[PDB]
Amino acid sequence: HMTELLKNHVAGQWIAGTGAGITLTDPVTGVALVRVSSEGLDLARAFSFAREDGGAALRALTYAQRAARLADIVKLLQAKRGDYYAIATANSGTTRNDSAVDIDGGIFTLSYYAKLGASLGEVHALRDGSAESLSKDRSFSAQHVLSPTRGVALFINAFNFPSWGLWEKAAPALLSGVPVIVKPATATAWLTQRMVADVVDAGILPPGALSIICGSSAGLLDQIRSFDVVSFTGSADTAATLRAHPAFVQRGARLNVQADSLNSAILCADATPDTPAFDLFIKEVVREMTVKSGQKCTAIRRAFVPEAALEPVLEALKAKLAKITVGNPRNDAVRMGSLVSREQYENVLAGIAALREEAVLAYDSSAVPLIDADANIAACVAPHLFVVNDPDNATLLHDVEVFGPVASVAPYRVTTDLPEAHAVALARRGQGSLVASIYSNDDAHLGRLALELADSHGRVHAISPSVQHSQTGHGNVMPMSLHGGPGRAGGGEELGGLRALAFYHRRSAIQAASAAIGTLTQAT
Amino acid sequence: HMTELLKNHVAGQWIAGTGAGITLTDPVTGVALVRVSSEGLDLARAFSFAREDGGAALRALTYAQRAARLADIVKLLQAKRGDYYAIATANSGTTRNDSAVDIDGGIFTLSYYAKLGASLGEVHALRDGSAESLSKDRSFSAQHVLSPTRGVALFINAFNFPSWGLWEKAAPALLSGVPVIVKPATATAWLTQRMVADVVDAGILPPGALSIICGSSAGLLDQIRSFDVVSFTGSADTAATLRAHPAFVQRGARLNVQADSLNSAILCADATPDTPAFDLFIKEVVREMTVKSGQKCTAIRRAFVPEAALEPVLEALKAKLAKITVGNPRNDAVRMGSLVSREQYENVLAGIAALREEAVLAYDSSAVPLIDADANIAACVAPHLFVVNDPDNATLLHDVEVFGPVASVAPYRVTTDLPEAHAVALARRGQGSLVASIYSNDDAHLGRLALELADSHGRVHAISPSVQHSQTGHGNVMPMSLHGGPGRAGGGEELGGLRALAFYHRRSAIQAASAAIGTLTQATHWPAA
C-alpha cells in the first residue's frame, strides 16, 4: 500500500504517470518491487523540450566538453554500483557475475566513448575524410563534414540489458550532441530509471539532454519528426510494426533495428577431441547458454560440429552443463539465476516444446532441485541441449529462437576438397545473424574462414588456443567492434567505435574556394 | 504502325512485354518514338537469375577486374554518343548542351568510378579501417571488413536523367559486385534502354549483371529480399508509398530515397551590386532555372538576398533571363528546349498559377513565340521569376516546388552583430535540401556560413571570385562529392567517391588472434588516404 511509483523525467521535470501503474516483480521470489506508468504525460511537450532546449544546449558544447560530461557520468555510476547490483539481483534474478555484464558492461562502454570523445577536440562538427581538389589549379576543393542532427534520439530498449542498452546507445548519442529519450522495457525498467535519476540529479548534463519514459509506449512514435533517430532493440515482429509507422514511412526518420538472431558456433574439422581447440568450443557453448540464462541476443543458438565429433561433443557438453547449478542468485553456490519473468518462463518452455517436435532432447536438468527458490514462483529454466541430426532438412533449427538456456547441436559434412564449407552454408540458413564464432587450432585458417561468414554475420569471433587467455567471448559486445547484423538480425549497426557517431550526424559535402576549405578545417 | 516496342533484358534474355505497350513521344514535335511494356514478364526468374548467376559471376571477379569492365563500358558509350544525342533530342527535347549534362555527365561519372575502382585492388573484400587491439598483450584484435551484399540492386529512376541516373547508381553497384536491375521512368526510358542494350550486346559484363525492365512497375518490390538494395529517385509522395511495402517493413531490404528539394541560393551581405560576387549569383540563378528547363532536382528554387539588394537583383535577373530563347532544340538559336512531356507541362503551368496566388511575377517571357514549335504541341514553358516580399509569413515559398524553369526571390533581414543568419533560417524552412549555394567576395566568410547550412543540406556550394572559372556549378553533381539530403530530400546518400560503396556492402567485425587478422588482411585492400 504500495511499492514506489517511479517517475518519468520529461521536459526537465520528474512527473508521475497516473493510475495504478504496472508492477515490476522479482523473478525468483515473486516480491513486488516498484511500479511504472506513462499515463497522462504531455508527449508533445516532452519531445519538443528535448529537441529544442536539450539539443540546443548539447550542440553549444564541443565534442570534448560532452566527452568530459560522459567521464563524470562514469565516475558517478561507478560510485553507485552497490545500489545497481541490488536492483539487478532483485529485478533481473541474475548472479553477480551476470549482473556485471549489464552494469559494468554499460559503464565500460560509456567510459570507452568518453575517452574516444576527448580525442575529437574543441570543435562543433567533424571532418569526414580528407579534402579533395575539384579543379586542375586546386582553387576549388571539397571537404565532407558531419554535423549533429537537429532532432532527438528515442531508444526503445529490450528487457535483457537495462543498463548496457541505455549506455551503448546514449554514449555515442550524447557525444554526438543529440538529446536522448529512453524507453526501457517495462519488466526490468527499474535499473534504467534509477541510473537516469542518479545522472539527472547530479546535474552533469543540461536540462533536456536526458529524458526517460517508463510504462506504455502509446503516442511516442507519433512525436518523431524527420531529423530524429529511433533505435529499437527487440523482436522481429515488433520491429515490423514500428517500421510501418508514419514517422519512418512518411517522415523518413532514421531507424535502427536489432532483432532476433540464431547465432552459430562452428567447430572446425581440425579441432578434434584430442586438441585444445575442442575444449574451448565446449566451454564457450556452455557459457553462452547459461550467462543470463541465455538471454543475450548474441548467445549461441546453433552449434555445428563435424559428423565424427558429434558424440564426443554431446558427451562433453552434458558433462559441463551438469555443473551449472540453478536458483536464487543471492546464494553463492548458484551459477545460473532466473529468466527475467514468469511470462518469459512460459514463453521459453513453449519454445522448448516446439523445438522438441523436430529435435532430440539430449540434456535437460529441469528435475534438479533449485537452490533457495520455489519452482512454482521463480522463473528458473534449466539448460536444455537439443540435437538435430539432419540440419539440411530441419525446419525449426534455422528459424525458431528460444530466448533462454537452450541451444541445438547439429553435425555437418566435412569437405575433403574450406573443410567447413557445409557449416558456413548452414550458418547462412539463419538468414543473417549478429555473430558467428569459429574454433580451430590453426589461426590462419580462422582468418580465411571468417571471410566466408562475413557477408551474413555482423561479427565473426575466432577462438583458438593462442587466445584462450585473451579472446573476449562469443556474446560479449566490445564497444570498439560493430554490433548488428543483416537480415533477421535487423539490418542495423551500432557501436564500432567512431562508426556509431554516423547515425547521429548528417553528412554534407562542402565545395568552396580552397582557402574556405582551410578555414572550415580550422573549425572542425 | 507501329513504333518499335523496346525489349526488356531479364534472366539473360531479351523479352518483349505483351500488349500494345506505352508510347514515348517527342515533347516538342509530338511524334511517337518507341513503346515499352513489362506485361507478362517472369519477375521471379528475372530477380533470381540476377541474384544467383549475376551476383556469383560479379563476385568471382576482383574489384579491379570489375573496374576494368567499367572502363570498357566508358569507351563503348563514348563511341555511341551520336546515337545517344539523337535519342535525347527527340525524347527529352533538350538542347545539345543540356543533353550533355545527362549523357556526358553519366559517362564522366562512370569513368570516375572505373578509375577509382582500379585502386580498390585485386581482392574480393575491402578493409574498413585498421585493427584494434582487444587485449593487453595484443594477441587478440578486431578488424572490420566490407563484403558485397548477396542480393540485387533495383534502381527506380526519375525521368530527368535517363543516362546519369543509370550510371551514377550502376557504377558503384557493379564495382561493388552487386548485379543491377534498372527500371527507368517510362516517359524518357528510351536512352536508358538503348545504353543497357549496347552494353549487354557488347558482352562486357557477365550474364545476369545488368537487367532492364521498362513499363509498369507492378510486382517488382514483391521480389525484393532482405539482402537486396533499392535506390529510388522521384517524388517524396511516391517514396512514402514504396517505404510501406513489405520488402522494407518486413524483410528489411535497404532503401535509398532521393526526392525533391527546394534548394536555396544565398547572396551574402557583402555581395552588393558593385562587386564581382553579385554577377556570379545572377548567372548561377539563371543557369539553374534554365538548364533542362529547370528539371534538375538540385536546381535553385529559392534565392535569398538582402533587403537592400532585392530590386537590383530582380532587375539583373530580368535582363539575363531575357537572353534565354525557347523552342525546338534542333534550332541553333534556341537556348532552352522543352520539359520532358506534355503532362509535366500541365503540372508546371498549374504550379506557376498556384505560386502566383502568393507571389508577384517579376519576369515571364510566355508571350514570346516559340522558335520552330507550336505551343499546343510542344511542352515548352518560358522562364518565370517570382518575388515573395515576406518570406517569414509565406505560405507556399518554402513548401511548393515547381519542377520547371521557375524560381522565387525573397529578401532577408541582414543581421549586424552571421550577417546571413536570417537567410540560413529561411533555407532551413525548406525542411531539408540537396544543396544550398552561397555567394560572397570574401572566401574566409564562406567556410563559416557553409557550416551553418550543413546540417540541413547534403551539399553546400560556395561561389566567389577566386573560383569564378573553377567552381563546378550549384546543380552539377560531382561524383567525388555526396549527393542526397535530409528531410524532404529523402534522407538518402549517393556518390561521395568511396562513400558510395557502403550501401552495396555488408560490414563485419572480425575478432581473432593476430595471425588470423593477418591472413584475413592479405585478402583485403583499401586505397591510401
Ligand SMILES: NC(=O)c1ccc[n+]([C@@H]2O[C@H](COP(=O)([O-])OP(=O)(O)OC[C@H]3O[C@@H](n4cnc5c(N)ncnc54)[C@H](OP(=O)(O)O)[C@@H]3O)[C@@H](O)[C@H]2O)c1
Ligand atoms: N531482438 C532481440 O534481441 C530479442 C530476442 C528475443 C526476445 N526479445 C524480446 O521481446 C521482448 C518482448 O518483445 P518486444 O520488446 O520486441 O515486443 P514487446 O514485448 O511487445 O515490446 C518491446 C517495446 O516495444 C514497444 N512497442 C511495442 N509497440 C510499439 C509501438 N507501436 N510503438 C512504440 N513502441 C512500441 C513496447 O512498448 P509497450 O510497453 O507499450 O508494450 C515494448 O516495451 C523484448 O524486450 C526482447 O528481448 C528480443
Ligand SMILES: NC(=O)c1ccc[n+]([C@@H]2O[C@H](COP(=O)([O-])OP(=O)(O)OC[C@H]3O[C@@H](n4cnc5c(N)ncnc54)[C@H](OP(=O)(O)O)[C@@H]3O)[C@@H](O)[C@H]2O)c1
Ligand atoms: N517529391 C518531390 O518534390 C521530388 C523529389 C525528387 C524528384 N522529383 C522529380 O520527380 C521527377 C520524376 O518522378 P515523378 O515526380 O514524375 O513521379 P515518380 O513516381 O516519383 O518518379 C520516379 C519513378 O517512380 C516510379 N513509380 C511510380 N509509382 C511507382 C510505384 N507504385 N511503384 C514503383 N515505382 C513507381 C515511376 O515510374 P514510371 O515513370 O514508369 O511511372 C517514376 O519513374 C524527377 O524528374 C524529379 O525531378 C520530385
